Amino acid sequence: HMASMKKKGSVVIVGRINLSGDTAYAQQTRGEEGCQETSQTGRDKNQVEGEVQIVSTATQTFLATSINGVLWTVYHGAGTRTIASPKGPVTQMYTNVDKDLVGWQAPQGSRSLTPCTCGSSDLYLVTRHADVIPVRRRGDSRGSLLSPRPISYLKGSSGGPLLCPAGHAVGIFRAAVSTRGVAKAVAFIPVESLETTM
Numbered sequence: 001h002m003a004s005m006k007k008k009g010s011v012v013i014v015g016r017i018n019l020s021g022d023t024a025y026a027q028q029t030r031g032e033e034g035c036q037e038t039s040q041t042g043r044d045k046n047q048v049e050g051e052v053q054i055v056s057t058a059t060q061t062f063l064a065t066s067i068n069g070v071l072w073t074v075y076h077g078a079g080t081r082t083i084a085s086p087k088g089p090v091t092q093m094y095t096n097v098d099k100d101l102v103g104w105q106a107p108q109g110s111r112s113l114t115p116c117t118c119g120s121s122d123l124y125l126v127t128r129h130a131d132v133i134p135v136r137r138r139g140d141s142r143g144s145l146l147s148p149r150p151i152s153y154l155k156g157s158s159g160g161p162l163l164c165p166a167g168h169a170v171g172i173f174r175a176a177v178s179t180r181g182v183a184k185a186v187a188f189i190p191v192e193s194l195e196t197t198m
């Protein structure tokens with residue numbers, strides 16, 4: 001009935017991947033109860049820092065990455081959802097199901113990565129566990145893991161960045177290619193396809 005129709009909650013920032021030092025590590029900034037409440041209200045007054053956020057809905061958790069001033073993630077995680085902010089829910093500024101891509105204005109206090117113009121194929125995937133995984137670029141939207149590992153280790157890291165040697169953003173991780181459960185390659189949205197979208 002129309003009176004009872006519910007609304008999906010917002011995506012919520014629940015942590016970050018700290019890349020500021022010589023050691024990468026995940027930090028949690030909100031626990032599951034606060035996450036649920038913030039998703040319903042859409043009001044998040046927690047201070048945001050850093051480039052790679054850990055984000056959650058009521059049912060899924062993944063990453064989101066700031067590049068020029070946009071917080072980017074995957075459509076298969078966020079759908080068309082708002083993100084929680086200090087002033088309430090914020091509507092997506094980019095949505096592209098064909099790329100598995102969404103974006104919101106980057107939160108106040110975030111730091112943005114710079115889009116790579118190096119043309120390098122020696123990349124680094126950052127996961128939600130703060131693993132920094134070498135990936136050889138193999139095409140516009142694909143790269144191979146130098147050390148394959150079970151897909152379990154990549155689950156929950158969609159929306160994370162592929163970085164070049166200089167720390168610029170080359171892409172947003174979106175899918176893993178596996179054989180017998182071992183991830184041998186990854187697919188990503190290339191930064192140019194974001195720069196086009198922008």
Ligand SMILES: COc1ccc2nc(C)c(O[C@@H]3C[C@H]4C(=O)N[C@]5(C(=O)NS(=O)(=O)C6(C)CC6)C[C@H]5/C=C\CCCCC[C@H](NC(=O)O[C@H](C)C(F)(F)F)C(=O)N4C3)nc2c1
Pocket residue numbers: 060061062063075076077097098099100151152154155156157158173174175176177187
């Ligand atoms: C609804 O509208 C949509 C529009 C476009 C769209 N486009 C893509 C490509 C898509 O793909 C889905 C979701 C991702 C995924 O699981 N994302 C990671 C992740 O971590 N998600 S997540 O954070 O856990 C989560 C679910 C919370 C958000 C990064 C994966 C980690 C481990 C793999 C686990 C087994 C899965 C292996 C899959 N392989 C694969 O499809 O490969 C083929 C050959 C491709 F062509 F894509 F390469 C895979 O990776 N998929 C399967 N769904 C959609 C949906």
Ligand SMILES: [Zn+2]
Pocket residue numbers: 115116117118119120164165166167168169
């Ligand atoms: Zn670069």
